[PDB]
Amino acid sequence: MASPLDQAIGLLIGIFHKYSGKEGDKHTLSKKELKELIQKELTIGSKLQDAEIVKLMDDLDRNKDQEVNFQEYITFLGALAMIYNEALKG
Amino acid sequence: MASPLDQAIGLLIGIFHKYSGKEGDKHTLSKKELKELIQKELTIGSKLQDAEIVKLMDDLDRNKDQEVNFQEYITFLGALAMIYNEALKG
Amino acid sequence: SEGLMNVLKKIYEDGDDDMKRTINKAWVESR
Amino acid sequence: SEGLMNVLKKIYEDGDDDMKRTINKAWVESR
Secondary structure (H helix, E strand, O other), X not given: OOHHHHXXXXXXXXXXXXXXXXXXXXXXXXXXXXXXXXXXXXOOOOOOOHHHHHHHHHHHHOOOXXXXXXXXXXXXXXXXXXXXXXXXXX | OHHHHHHHHHHHHHHHHHHHOOOOOOOEEEHHHHXXXXXXXXXXXXXXXXXXHHHHHHHHHOOOOOEEEHXXXXXXXXXXXXXXXXXXXX | OOOOHXXXXXXXXXXXXXXXXXXXXXXXXXX | OOOHHHHHHXXXXXXXXXXXXXXXXXXXXXX
């Protein structure tokens, strides 16, 4: 009965598939659709950090420039969770 | 949204670090850690599947051939999330 | 076949009810 | 190498901190 982890990986699915579902059934996000996910999930509205988001987009696009696949988007969230610093300390 | 994702990536670390840090400050899961993590935190569908859980553990260790590291464990959870393909088709 | 996905497909059979609710919540926030 | 962790730090420092709350819950609730 895997509910606690299955619903957390289900959060990442339910976030990701909104943005591909804007054009079709696909398991990928194109570089500008990936940037839409970042701005619509992490609502930094009117802040100067969009210049950091175009570099975060270049870190995500380093997996594939044309469109970033769901598994590599989760590999990147694995780096994001590791770089959180305090999370792996308590 | 941000807070819904930030708690979901916190579920993966809230599960993982109890096993990796069980006998030190360590940030990797050995073959016993990953099996104890699944059987405690996720349990199972039926205890007859435990022979496939040790094969899933061997497919997790496929990345390093001794003990599996945090980003590779999350990358494999991206493949496990891809097995729920209907949620990634909509 | 690939072999990998056929071992991972056994974990789908676990029978959870919350994952399919949480995906809907993560979609419904953007209605 | 690229300055990955220095750009990803700008997201750590923007997150709502439920990461560390959920970790501490998961560390207590399993007993």
